[model samples]
Target: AYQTIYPYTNEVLHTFDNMTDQGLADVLERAHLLYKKWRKEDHLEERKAQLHQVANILRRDRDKYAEIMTKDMGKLFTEAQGEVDLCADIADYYADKADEFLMSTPLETDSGQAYYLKQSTGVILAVEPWNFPYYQIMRVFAPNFIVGNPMVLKHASICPRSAQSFEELVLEAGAEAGSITNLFISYDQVSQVIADKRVVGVCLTGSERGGASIAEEAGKNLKKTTLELGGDDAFIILDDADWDQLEKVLYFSRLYNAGQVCTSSKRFIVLDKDYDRFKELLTKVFKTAKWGDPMDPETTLAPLSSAQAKADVLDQIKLALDHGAELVYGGEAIDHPGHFVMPTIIAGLTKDNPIYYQEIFGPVGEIYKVSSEEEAIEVANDSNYGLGGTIFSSNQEHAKAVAAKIETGMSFINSGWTSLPELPFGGIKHSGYGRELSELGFTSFVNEHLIYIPN
Candidate 1:
């Protein structure tokens, strides 16, 4: 059994017994059976039509559910609401676009007319994390549900309530039994699920270590895996950037969600001409960040998900400092009762420091000064993780050209990067392979079977 504690209050919110072997078997069997029944559904419109109800229910209970997310993981109320609403948008996107995304591609061949068809790949296992308990699950589950793939979800232990609540909402929206199942199972059970014959693939949104562990298991079983792993994304500011714009966008990119986001801008690469000015402006903003109870709508900065998380981030910062990294702003945990850390900024680290090549998962930004676009790209691509990044410049063309050189799977110019339902999200290198969201994500677990007819 495991207990989920309220991050703000440190009170036990709920306790759940981990699923037993037979219990996990029952859920897996049910999902496999559901996939069999669902894959035969010739009317794609019927499935799409049901998602309208899913979207409506999500909107109807936005505040109620957002509160659960805040209690479960210390997400600020406004951001939690956005996460909930974004799920609605994702559901609606699949409802509107699933038919086109899964449409058959006709081909002309010597034999006759041939076409490629898309079919469900049976049950999919989703292993999601706590930082974005709701959104992460929805991104994988929503589209897969619309395309007739049954989902077996295992959420992070710290935020089980959000997972349970999400499953309830989907069922309440009139989804058939077994369309989605949340399993409170152990790591051993997860390995068994990946190896199960009925389970076709595994999708994970988590750390590099978790992705490697899970992906290794799936590989052993010859199953498909999509991993959205960790990132130390670079936020680059060019010499001619709008100082006001850079400061505003960079602040949100680095500090939002307590900087626990995989795509949250962690490394700041500034052109030598703008380095001093940008550092001063960003440090000024970081110095004034408000950290308190997440339920307080006015609070801009929230605590990390748990005391352990706070301690982990603090240890990493100390290591950076020990290895010659200079702290420009806050680094110590606040004297508050909650798991709050002072929003921090660091700089002056050489390549010799280990933190220079690591992903810092907190409200900390590492600033690096560069001489030119080449140096900026060099610094950005030097990390082991390459998830998402951003570049800022008054000249859009210059920023776009520079962004093309960054090694991450995705990057943005002149704005804060966002996870829209239309854009594909994932990364390269140690950031993990495969895409999530958009048309690309919808087909990640489907089989593109080819059919030919002789004249």
Candidate 2:
């Protein structure tokens, strides 16, 4: 049984229902029907307008949904609400612009009559995690809907309200009843769901293990898949830099979502001269962050979405210290019963530590000290996963220069990564391939067909 470690009150938030093989068939069939109707329907403008209405409805209930998300997913209500706002922004963005995005300009080629169309695929399977529930769904929701593809959303078990509420709002806003289907299923059930013919593509934002399994299945089926997976994104500080920079970076990095983000600042690469001082600052920050009832607006950190996430993260902690890393700060699970880990921070971590290459998927942040920029680069690139990275330098020119060499899908100079529609987001190497967000994201799913007209 999982145990809650934050907020000091141990209580069950939810239990996920099983999405059986038959259930998968049900969701997929509905999705297929939705695709045919939404695509074939006239009044593309009407379709866009109706979908945009859902955005307004979502904004109207942002607080209501945000509160539920915080309770269900242990997201800080502040950030949780912002996630909802971002979803609406994305929805608005697509609603106002998807027609232009999908415009099919006829192209001449060879000598026969033919033209190009971004044909919409009929069904999309979205395996959404609870971390940023609505936000994750938004990435798929409007774009696929506009493209005339229906979605089968399989939500993480922990956050039922957020998932179901999403469907409720969209339907309330006049979505065709079958267009967005939400399900709760076990791993076995998920595979069966995606393996079906109607589930043309699959997408997810979650762990490495989950991404790998889904991607493998999609590959074998020749179906499209998008993965936004695990990150132990590095925070590198050069030797000549201000040693105290990590004070803010490490604090926000590890405890931002209380360290639950896939792109959270998971690792710290310090130039040794400043490593110990930085560690001191890290410990101070970890201790001050409030961990309380997620329902309380004042609580900065909430319980993890479930007891299971807390347990798993604690397991990773034991593995980290045993693997030769020094825990300069909190290591034991919190005395309280909620799913909390004391906003964990570790220091004096060596290259030889087993945790060195691992992404600690909790509030834990590991501090590494390097002797030189070369060592910083060497150790940073040593990881098998490369989703995101950050660098801090007093000089803007110097920081950008270093950021360019960080070997990650996205990098920021003197800041943590933020998902923006203007920039492409995804990973390279073990973090997974392909990009999402902005124009690149739309094209990823667009049908770029060629036509040849007789000349």
Candidate 3:
């Protein structure tokens, strides 16, 4: 059974039975049948109109979906609302740009004419994480829907309601029934889905182990897959960075969504001259966070996604301490009903520390003091995961120069990385392959066929 346990209360909110084998087969067959008709050129206008309607529905029912997210996964209500808004924008973005994005690119030929035609492939299976449930689904669904590829979503077990709600929204927006199908299935079933002939591609956003397993199955089936996995991204503070902006960004980067974000700046790399002051500022910012019900606007620190998630984070903190790292502040679990951990900070994590290379998926900031900018870049690039990173400096050119050195898919100068509809998002190495959002995402699962004519 797939369960939705309220992270803030540790109470079961909903339970859904996993689909039977026959049921799963029916879903795949239905998606494949729809894809045949949906992929035709005549449906492009209808797809655009449906996506706009989806965006409209999202904006109209923003509060309803936001509450569901908070109850399902302990996301702060305000941030949940922001996520819904972002999803709407993503849908609208694809709706507005689909025609141009898929337009044939004409090539100059001496003797004949040639062009590249972007066409839809087949049904896609999306295995999404619970952290940003709506946003994750929208990123994959918006572009794929525009491309006429039906999406079969297998969301995190904890956010089944969020998954169901999204599917309902798409259908309510007048999209075909199979345009977005939500599945509550087991790991074995996931492998089966990947092996199925109808599902042409797979997209996953999760842990490294999960990505590896999914990639292995998809590879064996010879299906195209895009994995957006974990990251321990670096937040570097240059010697000349504006202190006020650094502090503000630090607060949001480390504590936003209780720092469960895959691209959250988990590592704080600061110049030796400013390491002490940086720690002081981090402690000050964490102390200001108020922990309470995620539904309450006054509450800044929300609980982790589940009791297991909270325990995993606490265990990682203890592991760091066992490795001789100093717990600077907020390492204890709060004595409350919710699955809450203190906004933690740890120092003295060396190269040999077990947690040094691991992605701490919580509000735990790991600090490193670097003697020079060269060493800072070295430390950031040393990780197996190169998802994203940030560099803060008053000089834009210098910050950009430093950002260029960080081995990451995306980097920000003077700001933390936030997903925008126009900018592509993904990572290199273990953080996974293939870009999502923007034009890159729109083309990820499509066939760019070259049409040539000879004289």
Candidate 4:
């Protein structure tokens, strides 16, 4: 059983019954039927046309859909609208580039003539989070759908309606029943779905616990798994950096989406020269940020998705405080009507603090002051995670040199790091493996085969 309660109002918005075993089986049975048709369709152009139509639908009613996202997950309405725009771009991007990317390529070989081809791998079980509900699913969906792999989505229980809304759009745009299916499924149902031979892989955008459980099941079944898990990503600044640009991205990087993003900059690494200045500015901003209903245009901070999310973030803050970290600013739930945690900033977290390794999933930032560029990189890489990071330096060459030493999967120089449709997105170490976006993500679930011929 799942009930969606409005975080801003604490009102019960809706309820859903979890699907039973037999019900899931029937859905999977239909999913297999849809997969056979989608995979066997020889013309990529047909699928591309369908995707374009979906993009048109996404843009045609952005406000209508954006409102749904805001209500369900407490995302700011403007950002929710932005997410819809991103989804449209993702859909359009894959539709436009599918031919060049998915084309069978002739290979030159000494032994014989050959070609490299790609094929769909059947139904993929997608488990996604609620933070950036539509964007997360679309990055996976746009690529796999274009490649003909049907999807069965198990979204964050909090965003059930958003998930359903997406499925409806897909079907409305002419997807067969198998092309996409959203389920309010139990944990056991998820495991069972992975065990089904028809389900070839698992794609998860969620926490370590969620990924580990699904990855374990997928592994036992000899299936493929791609995880875009947690990150304690860092934002490093040097003496030569453009503080104006740095300040802009740094503020939005932590506060955007209320800092629930997997790649959100959780740690701030500043030079000794700029440390006091940056900390002062960041703390001052968080102290004065306005919090209210997500629907209100003037609101700078929105509630977390639910009351439980607020409680959990507060617990993490308490743990950090108990571990001797100085809470330099806000770290409490307000007496307001919504599930809001005040934007917070903390400093002086020692190397041994357990909270040092944890991800603060709300609008909280951990700031660190360092003496040099080397020390900054050392503190940045001294983590169990290597998801992504941002480097700020006015001297492009210096920033490039510093970025090269970082062990993360991706890094940006002099600007905020964000997910783009044309670029790859993911991390290394415990932040999970593989990639998303661009060619890397599109081909993650496809069967790339090299066919050889006898001389």
Candidate 5:
């Protein structure tokens, strides 16, 4: 059963039974059949109109959707509303640009005129996480829906309500019956979906282990896959960084969503000259966090998604300390009713520390002090995951130069990590492959068919 338990109160909200094999099969077949008709160029205008409608519906019911996310996943209510807004922006972006993005570019040939048509291939399987439930699904759904590639979603068990809400909204916006189907399915069922002949691609936003498993299954069946596994992104603070800007960026980047963000700066690498001041600021900011119900406006700190999530983060903190990483503050579980871990910071983490290369998914942060710019870059690039990072510096050129050397997919200067409708998001190395959003995300699962006129 897919259960939605309130992470803030540790109370069961709802439970949904897994879809039956026959029901799952019906959905897959319906999506495949719909793809046959929906992929035609004739439906392009209709798809765009429907996408616009999705955006409007998202905004109209933003409060309702935000509440569902907060109750289901422990996301702050305000952050959850912001996520809904982002999703609406994504829908509008693709609605406005899908035609241009899918347009064919002329190819020069010795004796022929050629171009490639970006056409829908088949159904895509999206296995997403609980955090930012709506945003995660939107990033995959917006582009694929416009491209006429139907999506079968396997959302996290903890946020079944969110999954249902999205499916309802898409349907309400007049998307085809099978345009996006949410399935409460087991691991075995997920394999079954990937193995189905109608499913041509798979995308997952989750753990590294889950990515490997899904990628292996997709690979064995010769289907394309994109995995956005989590990241251990570094926040490099240079000596020249502005104190005022650094203070604001530091608080939001590390504590937003209780630091469950995959691209949040989990590792703080500070130059030797500014290490002490940086640590002091971080500690001071973390101390201001107010822990309470997620729905409350004053709650800066929310619970983890579940009891298990809280336990896992606590275990990671313990492991880091046992391996010589010094706990700077907030290491123990809070004695409250919910699944909460105190906002934690551990310093003196060397490369050999067990948690040094790990991605801490909660509010726990690891601080590393480095001697020079080169050492900071080295420490930033030392992680096994290369998703995103932030570099704080007064010099734009120097920051760009440093950003160029970082081995992540995206880097921000003088700010924390963020995503927009037009930018591509994803990482390299164990952080997974491919891109989401922008033109790249728009083309991720499409079939580029070549058309040539020979002279």
Candidate 6:
């Protein structure tokens, strides 16, 4: 894939180029310089208007941007459109919601009546992923932009088109020059920039490998970092759950964004009594679910993000096939022009399997049957990753109890899981740290200083 697709090309979703280390460093320099100037502004209203313009542009170009997302990342047109809409809504969320967030109150202290001031620091760096290209960008953009701090986005170079699309949107929205700078740089360059004093903090939405590296770099520089890494979120299904609703829940958990979501539920911990029926329903869900060309609006699932993604998924599937994991829906790759992998489900994987703690990052799912509710929670919480988890049980009390046991930033009852602008989002353990949305998300970067007046 090439970095720039023709204006009308269907494959606009493809990542055409990878960013070099040098290119990324250049962008960081520009962001720091912008920060140096931006932080000096006394009023945030000016920055607010520019962000509002970004929201307006996002709304106006929703259709065009949605198409680009689908073409490049294999997200369904509907989901792509949702991503575009989310971008606008996200901006609106921060723009309309930032007043209270940025407000500072006087903190009269004993020490000469000191007061507090909360303000932007300097440049912040973000490493975005391509799963929901626009949503991922806005996730970082909404809050950071509101803080009156400039940012430099380093998108996954493999998805260069996504990176370019994000940059273009900000520019098209008439945002101030260097408000949200980007250089499409490599990890090495990202590390170098983190070391520079001008770069205040770093945020990343990626896999363990990416998260680990960025966290390390940020640590070395003493810059705070947040990582929303991969998840093997356990979806526990108790015998008392609504059987009819099971399919609908699992549909999005495994099929949404072609199952690339970091928080998407992948581990199916079923109660032994209903395991057979649940497996039957789950098999039906995957079997009837359509997969193929993403251009087809009727298509329920798209191909994996890249050839590498497909290969890794296949390798895991093969390993499971040889082991005790039962192949329920799919196990082999279908011959398609796109980097496609068939949606697969297995019923007998053990906790000991190497894939147990691993995030598939594809359409592959593992179903582990547990004899008791206690066992379900025990197995679910045993995983090292805890970004998100889901529970399907009749007892609300029991569900919450089980949900709590599973280590994750957020937990869902009955439903698989989804995120919004209002709630805090992020994870713990290997899944990374820090929240990405809501009040907590906004306050993560602020510098609060106290002011006092002796009356």
Per model, how many backbone clashes are there?
A: 0, 11, 0, 3, 0, 14
In angstroms, what RMSD does candidate 6 have relative to the true structure? Answer: 2.9
Which is the winner by TM-score between candidate 4 and candidate 6? 4
Scanning candidate 2 in windows of ten residues, the lowest lDDT window is 1-10
Each candidate structure's TM-score, on Cα atoms with residue i matched to residue i, is 0.98, 0.91, 0.99, 0.97, 0.99, 0.92
Which residue segments of model 2 deviate by more than 4 Å? 1-8, 13-23, 105-115, 239-249
Give the higher-TM-score candidate: 2 or 5.
5
Of candidate 5, the 10-residue stretch with the lowest lDDT total is 38-47
What is the lDDT, from 0 to 100, of the residue 114 in candidate 6? 64
- Residues 99-138 of candidate 4: C-alpha lDDT, one tens digit per residue: 8888898987888899989888789889999998799889
Ranking by lDDT: 3, 5, 1, 4, 6, 2
Error of 4 at 389 (Å): 0.7
Candidate 5, clashing residue pairs? none
Task: Report the C-alpha lDDT of model 6 over 40-86, residue by residue, as the tens digit.
Answer: 66546766777788889878878788877766666777888887777
Q: Which candidate has the top score in lDDT?
A: 3
Better of 1 and 6 by TM-score: 1
Error of 3 at 75 (Å): 0.8
Per-residue error (Å), model 2, residue 19: 4.7
Over the full model, what C-alpha lDDT does candidate 4 score relative to the true structure? 0.87
Please say which candidate is ahead in TM-score: 1 or 5. Answer: 5
Sequence-dependent TM-score of model 4? 0.97
Write one digit per residue (lDDT tens) for candidate 1, span 347-396. 99889998998888899988999998888899999888889999888998
RMSD of each: 1.2, 2.9, 0.9, 1.3, 0.9, 2.9
Question: After superposition, which runs of candidate 6 have C-alpha atoms over 4 Å from their true positions?
Answer: 1-26, 106-115, 452-455
